[PDB]
Design a protein around this ligand. Structure first.
Ligand SMILES: [K+]
Ligand SMILES: [K+]
Ligand SMILES: [K+]
Ligand SMILES: [K+]
Ligand SMILES: [K+]
Ligand SMILES: [K+]
Ligand SMILES: [K+]
Ligand SMILES: [K+]
Ligand SMILES: [K+]
Ligand SMILES: [K+]
Ligand SMILES: [K+]
Ligand SMILES: [K+]
Ligand SMILES: [K+]
Ligand SMILES: [K+]
Ligand SMILES: [Mg+2]
Ligand SMILES: [Mg+2]
Ligand SMILES: [Mg+2]
Ligand SMILES: [Mg+2]
Ligand SMILES: [Mg+2]
Ligand SMILES: [Mg+2]
Ligand SMILES: [Mg+2]
Ligand SMILES: [Mg+2]
Ligand SMILES: [Mg+2]
Ligand SMILES: [Mg+2]
Ligand SMILES: [Mg+2]
Ligand SMILES: [Mg+2]
Ligand SMILES: [Mg+2]
Ligand SMILES: [Mg+2]
Ligand SMILES: [Mg+2]
Ligand SMILES: [Mg+2]
Ligand SMILES: [Mg+2]
Ligand SMILES: [Mg+2]
Ligand SMILES: [Mg+2]
Ligand SMILES: [Mg+2]
Ligand SMILES: [Mg+2]
Ligand SMILES: [Mg+2]
Ligand SMILES: [Mg+2]
Ligand SMILES: [Mg+2]
Ligand SMILES: [Mg+2]
Ligand SMILES: [Mg+2]
Ligand SMILES: [Mg+2]
Ligand SMILES: [Mg+2]
Ligand SMILES: [Mg+2]
Ligand SMILES: [Mg+2]
Ligand SMILES: [Mg+2]
Ligand SMILES: [Mg+2]
Ligand SMILES: [Mg+2]
Ligand SMILES: [Mg+2]
Ligand SMILES: [Mg+2]
Ligand SMILES: [Mg+2]
Ligand SMILES: [Mg+2]
Ligand SMILES: [Mg+2]
Ligand SMILES: [Mg+2]
Ligand SMILES: [Mg+2]
Ligand SMILES: [Mg+2]
Ligand SMILES: [Mg+2]
Ligand SMILES: [Mg+2]
Ligand SMILES: [Mg+2]
Ligand SMILES: [Mg+2]
Ligand SMILES: [Mg+2]
Ligand SMILES: [Mg+2]
Ligand SMILES: [Mg+2]
Ligand SMILES: [Mg+2]
Ligand SMILES: [Mg+2]
Ligand SMILES: [Mg+2]
Ligand SMILES: [Mg+2]
Ligand SMILES: [Mg+2]
Ligand SMILES: [Mg+2]
Ligand SMILES: [Mg+2]
Ligand SMILES: [Mg+2]
Ligand SMILES: [Mg+2]
Ligand SMILES: [Mg+2]
Ligand SMILES: [Mg+2]
Ligand SMILES: [Mg+2]
Ligand SMILES: [Mg+2]
Ligand SMILES: [Mg+2]
Ligand SMILES: [Mg+2]
Ligand SMILES: [Mg+2]
Ligand SMILES: [Mg+2]
Ligand SMILES: [Mg+2]
Ligand SMILES: [Mg+2]
Ligand SMILES: [Mg+2]
Ligand SMILES: [Mg+2]
Ligand SMILES: [Mg+2]
Ligand SMILES: [Mg+2]
Ligand SMILES: [Mg+2]
Ligand SMILES: [Mg+2]
Ligand SMILES: [Mg+2]
Ligand SMILES: [Mg+2]
Ligand SMILES: [Mg+2]
Ligand SMILES: [Mg+2]
Ligand SMILES: [Mg+2]
Ligand SMILES: [Mg+2]
Ligand SMILES: [Mg+2]
Ligand SMILES: [Mg+2]
Ligand SMILES: [Mg+2]
Ligand SMILES: [Mg+2]
Ligand SMILES: [Mg+2]
Ligand SMILES: [Mg+2]
Ligand SMILES: [Mg+2]
Ligand SMILES: [Mg+2]
Ligand SMILES: [Mg+2]
Ligand SMILES: [Mg+2]
Ligand SMILES: [Mg+2]
Ligand SMILES: [Mg+2]
Ligand SMILES: [Mg+2]
Ligand SMILES: [Mg+2]
Ligand SMILES: [Mg+2]
Ligand SMILES: [Mg+2]
Lengths: 159, 240
RNA sequence: ACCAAAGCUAGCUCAACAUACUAAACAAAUACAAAAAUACACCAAAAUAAAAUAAAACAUUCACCUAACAUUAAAGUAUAGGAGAUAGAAAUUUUUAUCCUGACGCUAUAGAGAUAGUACCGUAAGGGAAAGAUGAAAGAAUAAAAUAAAAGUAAAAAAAAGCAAAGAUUACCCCUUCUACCUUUUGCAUAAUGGUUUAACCAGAAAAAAUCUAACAAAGAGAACUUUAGCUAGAUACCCCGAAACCAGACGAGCUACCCAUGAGCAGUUUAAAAGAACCAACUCAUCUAUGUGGCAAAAUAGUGAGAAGACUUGUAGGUAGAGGUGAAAA
RNA sequence: CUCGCACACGCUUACAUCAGUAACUAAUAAUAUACUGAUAAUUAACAACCAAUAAACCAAAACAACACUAAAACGUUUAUUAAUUACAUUGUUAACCCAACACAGGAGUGCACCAAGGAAAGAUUAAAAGAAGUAAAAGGAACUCGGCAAACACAAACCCCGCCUGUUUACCAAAAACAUCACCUCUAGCAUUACUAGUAUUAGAGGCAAUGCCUGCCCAGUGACACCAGUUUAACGGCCGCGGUAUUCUGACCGUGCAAAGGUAGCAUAAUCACUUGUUCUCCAAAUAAGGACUUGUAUGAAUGGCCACACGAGGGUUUUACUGUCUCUUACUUCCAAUCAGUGAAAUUAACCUUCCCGUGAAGAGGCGGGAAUAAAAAAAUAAGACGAGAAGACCCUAUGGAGCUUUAAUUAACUAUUCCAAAAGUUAAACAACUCAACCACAAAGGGAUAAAACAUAACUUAACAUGGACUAGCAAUUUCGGUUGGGGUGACC
RNA sequence: AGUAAGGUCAGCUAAAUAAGCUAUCGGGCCCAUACCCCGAAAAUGUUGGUUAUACCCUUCCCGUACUACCA
């Protein structure tokens, strides 16, 4: 979004101008997930895919600031969890193929506690944190019973 | 505020259905077509355009139906006729001289030699004679009748070449269409609709036309008697 | 002698410190037409701010104007500008903690709009006030103290003659002499402008060069600069009210223009007629004249008129919103 | 004397009983539906709230027998389900609502015009002026812009412009303006929200106005189409001079020039620049009026329509008849105002006034200056010459490097819609043709000598529906901004 | 009033290389006239200045043309 000068002359009229990227419809193949996604991609994205020598490499090498897409972050998080968990569901019939796929991306392996928070926004993380910490209140009957037992054992050991 | 179109009925029924006027207002609520509104209240009859439609898929053969009555349809400029056959009834557009107690044959079997052209029969363009007047032209096989439905309008078949028929529309423009499309032989009813005279300004209001605006616009370059060559033939046949 | 006058509190303003920042109240009911316990869902959204202005016009441009992380300097320098108006950095530098926080700020036409966003004016967004005074005790109202001083009246109407007064005079007039006041103009008593009168409130502001006074002086200044008598500090300065407009975002079709729904009216008379025919009411428009002109009425009353089975009147409710809507074009 | 009861919508206790009103509210008093305090009230049968799905059914309301064109609100039955269980919740008053008011205004339906609901005059006198009503001698438009108004009149005819009913500037114009049936031009071969649940006898963008007789000539320019030549005026628009010529007049004719064609039919001193009160006849005692003719109207004229006619008109003009206070010429009598008495009590305005006449003077029209005249002070009721009267910071006119609306052949130029090209993107195909033997071999078919290359292009060529990006072209629509000065007031001419 | 604007053979036009057509004059063709063919003559409104003239400017004269508006 910006302005421009007609005829590229400074003394000319000032004009509002919007430049839009040219969008294309392509379906891409990811080796980690073995699924085809029909994703609106640009010619620059395909060039970056070739530059990284792989669709999975492009997602796993480009950082968040370079990707600028929530789908990309979720796509990375899905594959990052796949590597850390080492899920046998990638190919239940070809264990040899499973080893080959994860061998090439062995440099991107991250621990489990790190691989499930890479594609989350601020709002999504808070909901996830609340869900893990969602605990029903402990009844005061249970608290008081433990308190009474401690006193009884304390009195028992005092005699 | 977005409005809802009155065309919500899903099942075909011969009985008249309720109808709401628009007045030129689109779904937004603004005027898009001027000079429409304030007409007499009307009911809509469900018109079956596809002449060839068997009751069941068990017997796809040609079937023959009977005409019960010919009525007046407020919506279109022609006259519609009630036609019953088997276990269903249909409203179809009546030709020039369709009357009560008449039998109409619907068929699709393309025969080599010919088939005699009757005033009500619907046959594919491949079996009709060269010099036949037709109406309710089906642009594509199974699409349905779209062309030549106004009062007194009849198209004439011209020739059939390499398994393809060429017809002449009422606008004197040649149209190319596959010979397997169904068409109806004859001229549409109410022939003298063009000769009808409106006696007063009020009769226009009854039909539903509002008076034109009073702004005086000077004529531009578009006006004047324009002589233009006939546009080339419109063909719906997809050449592989 | 009436009308009036006087009071000093209510609270407010600007900071500082500071926890770290949508208060108080939530028993029940609150986004059905909010404050109405209770039924098969749809749910949601973003697109650079523009212009009034300055350049004495106005088209490129016009500080602050959403998002800076500060202070002493580099500096109003390099640069960017119809090279005009004006816009304007950085490299590189400087900054010792806590208490000492209160007032050469106002006192009911001031200070917040506030006793209050309440009355009240608007369909709505929105606009938005005036208003308090006794004493220690009024469980001292045959109650008490205080100025009796604004315009306006009363006590007390007026007696030839004149910008209303002055010179005077034994004596108020009588006599003599004097063309109201500001603004605006070559020139105004002008019959040119403004003011009934009273109280309260209401309009000159900036320190580059300079002049005056003083400190120290070839050096001055409590860093950063200026210097061939100069440097540092003080004092001396440049108003108020008013347009038609322009741009952005909201709120309005309960009046009116048109349309979509759903309803309701047209008696008698004349004609084979429910024929945009005819006579004439209800009903709907408003031709002509007279009253009315701060009126009964911010468009009416009286008489008289045109249509009155239609392109007709009419109730309820919904739709189109300003670069537009709508229009049997009257801008 | 007559807008009465009730419901809906709205208002929200203003309603009812009792008491009080010195003061507040009523534009006054009595007094209390309207102001204050206390207490009390509208009871459901009426009204609101008050099932879903599948299937059969082409056949109007108007006393509806049966029909018309504009084709029409208004449902029953069968099947599968539906908590089954006295008493649920809510609206019930009024003299009322919207208009700043207890306003002569605005306000839907049912039934009556009354059996119901209300009070034009606070008390006097009986002046002028003003408003409303009745009557009139003789004359009957002599009034006047006009027969406006009024009338014991309530009729007849001609013309102009529109055909007609209808519509518009709410609040100065209701018309000759707009619309309209008719005619004509133009653009479009078609599907799920307009047009349309349609399909060229259809639907939009316009012009002109029924009917009848007609709508002449012109593509040079502009515009549009074709997007090339070209084609289009019921597209914007246009549709001529000079000189001579039949005794005189007129000019059939002729010479010559320019044009895309040179105004044809018709009508005509008109609603038609000026000349203009053209000329003439009829109407009148008298005609700048009205009708009928003459007619270059050098600026009438043919769908920006010409011309003629029926019907129609709260449009505009003229004539006759009848009526009358319009008028010669005013008068009498009533009501509301008016004047006196009692109650309540506002507005524009106001420098101070102890506020005269005349002539002269003067910022050029003096109650105030100068020279003279007049002159006890006050109240009430009248007439409008002056106070350059009061009202609105003049609408006219000019100025302002002050605004805005409209139009385009002004300057600058996007977005958006549509047309076209290039690029991006996707896809398709690819390894190539003009001898002739003159000699002469060969049974043919051909051959050899006298050419049989290279190359296709270092990729090339073409197609591409729907969406859609960047950069250009054309058009529509539209955005920004201005429109110099001097001038014996501005414009115009001229000047700088 | 102002401004605009033009004059050319007898007539009308185009060029300033003063031409073309017609008219006029003479001759031929025909019975005669006209047509037709052949030959000749003919002009830059006016004054002054434009090296010198002409197309130009100026003066005189005729005639043509537009406009004369807001109150
Ligand atoms: K029809
Ligand atoms: K004045
Ligand atoms: K002045
Ligand atoms: K003043
Ligand atoms: K609405
Ligand atoms: K009123
Ligand atoms: K009320
Ligand atoms: K007259
Ligand atoms: K009218
Ligand atoms: K043309
Ligand atoms: K005449
Ligand atoms: K009329
Ligand atoms: K007077
Ligand atoms: K003058
Ligand atoms: Mg229709
Ligand atoms: Mg039309
Ligand atoms: Mg029109
Ligand atoms: Mg400026
Ligand atoms: Mg200025
Ligand atoms: Mg700005
Ligand atoms: Mg430059
Ligand atoms: Mg205050
Ligand atoms: Mg004060
Ligand atoms: Mg006083
Ligand atoms: Mg004196
Ligand atoms: Mg003087
Ligand atoms: Mg003066
Ligand atoms: Mg001066
Ligand atoms: Mg004065
Ligand atoms: Mg003045
Ligand atoms: Mg004054
Ligand atoms: Mg200084
Ligand atoms: Mg601007
Ligand atoms: Mg705006
Ligand atoms: Mg409405
Ligand atoms: Mg009737
Ligand atoms: Mg009628
Ligand atoms: Mg009236
Ligand atoms: Mg009246
Ligand atoms: Mg009367
Ligand atoms: Mg009538
Ligand atoms: Mg009538
Ligand atoms: Mg809205
Ligand atoms: Mg508009
Ligand atoms: Mg209308
Ligand atoms: Mg107009
Ligand atoms: Mg106008
Ligand atoms: Mg009220
Ligand atoms: Mg009363
Ligand atoms: Mg009482
Ligand atoms: Mg009471
Ligand atoms: Mg009143
Ligand atoms: Mg009374
Ligand atoms: Mg009285
Ligand atoms: Mg009188
Ligand atoms: Mg009388
Ligand atoms: Mg008389
Ligand atoms: Mg007379
Ligand atoms: Mg007279
Ligand atoms: Mg008149
Ligand atoms: Mg009259
Ligand atoms: Mg006339
Ligand atoms: Mg009319
Ligand atoms: Mg006529
Ligand atoms: Mg009418
Ligand atoms: Mg009006
Ligand atoms: Mg009206
Ligand atoms: Mg009127
Ligand atoms: Mg015709
Ligand atoms: Mg006509
Ligand atoms: Mg018309
Ligand atoms: Mg006309
Ligand atoms: Mg024509
Ligand atoms: Mg052409
Ligand atoms: Mg004539
Ligand atoms: Mg005429
Ligand atoms: Mg004239
Ligand atoms: Mg007249
Ligand atoms: Mg007369
Ligand atoms: Mg005449
Ligand atoms: Mg003309
Ligand atoms: Mg035309
Ligand atoms: Mg004309
Ligand atoms: Mg008629
Ligand atoms: Mg008439
Ligand atoms: Mg008479
Ligand atoms: Mg009195
Ligand atoms: Mg006096
Ligand atoms: Mg005088
Ligand atoms: Mg004197
Ligand atoms: Mg004097
Ligand atoms: Mg009086
Ligand atoms: Mg008086
Ligand atoms: Mg005076
Ligand atoms: Mg006067
Ligand atoms: Mg005055
Ligand atoms: Mg002024
Ligand atoms: Mg003006
Ligand atoms: Mg100036
Ligand atoms: Mg300006
Ligand atoms: Mg401006
Ligand atoms: Mg504007
Ligand atoms: Mg231009
Ligand atoms: Mg682009
Ligand atoms: Mg701008
Ligand atoms: Mg000018
Ligand atoms: Mg000037
Ligand atoms: Mg002048
Ligand atoms: Mg000029």
């Amino acid at each position: 979004l910006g302005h421009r000068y007609v005829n590229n002359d400074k003394l000319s009229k000032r004009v509002r101008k919007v430049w839009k990227p040219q969008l294309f419809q392509r379906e891409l193949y990811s080796e980690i997930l073995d699924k085809r996604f029909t994703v609106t991609v640009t010619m620059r994205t395909l060039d970056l895919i070739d530059q990284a020598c792989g669709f999975d490499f492009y997602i796993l090498k480009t950082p968040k600031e370079d990707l600028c897409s929530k789908f990309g972050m979720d796509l990375k998080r899905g594959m990052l969890l796949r590597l850390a968990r080492q899920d046998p569901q990638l190919h239940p019939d070809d264990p040899a193929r499973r080893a080959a796929i994860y061998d090439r991306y062995k440099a991107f392996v991250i621990p489990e506690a790190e691989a499930e928070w890479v594609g989350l926004t601020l709002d999504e993380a808070v909901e996830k944190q609340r869900l893990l910490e969602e605990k029903d209140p402990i009844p005061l009957f249970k608290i008081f019973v433990e308190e009474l037992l401690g006193q009884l054992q304390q009195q028992a050991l005092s005699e | 505020a977005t409005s809802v179109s009155w065309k919500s009925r899903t099942k075909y029924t011969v009985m008249p259905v309720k109808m709401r006027k628009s007045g030129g207002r689109n779904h937004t609520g603004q005027i898009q077509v001027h000079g429409i509104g304030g007409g007499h209240k009307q009911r809509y009859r469900m018109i079956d355009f596809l002449r060839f439609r068997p009751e069941h898929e068990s017997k796809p053969g040609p079937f023959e139906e009977k005409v019960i009555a010919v009525r007046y349809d407020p919506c279109r400029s022609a006259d519609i006729a009630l036609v019953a056959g088997g276990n269903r009834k249909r409203w179809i557009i009546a030709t020039e001289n369709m009357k009560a107690g008449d039998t109409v044959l619907n068929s699709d079997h393309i025969g080599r030699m010919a088939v005699a052209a009757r005033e009500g029969d619907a046959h594919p363009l491949g079996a009709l004679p060269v010099g036949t007047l037709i109406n309710n032209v089906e642009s594509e096989p199974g699409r349905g009748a779209q062309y030549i439905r106004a009062a007194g309008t009849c198209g004439v078949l011209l020739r059939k070449v390499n398994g393809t028929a060429i017809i002449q529309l009422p606008s004197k423009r040649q149209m190319q269409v596959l010979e397997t499309c169904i068409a109806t032989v004859g001229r549409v009813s109410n022939v003298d609709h063009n000769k009808r005279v409106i006696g007063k300004a009020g009769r226009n209001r009854w039909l539903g036309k509002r008076p034109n605006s009073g702004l005086w616009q000077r004529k531009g370059g578009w006006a004047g008697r324009k002589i233009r060559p006939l546009p080339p033939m419109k063909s719906y046949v997809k050449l592989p």
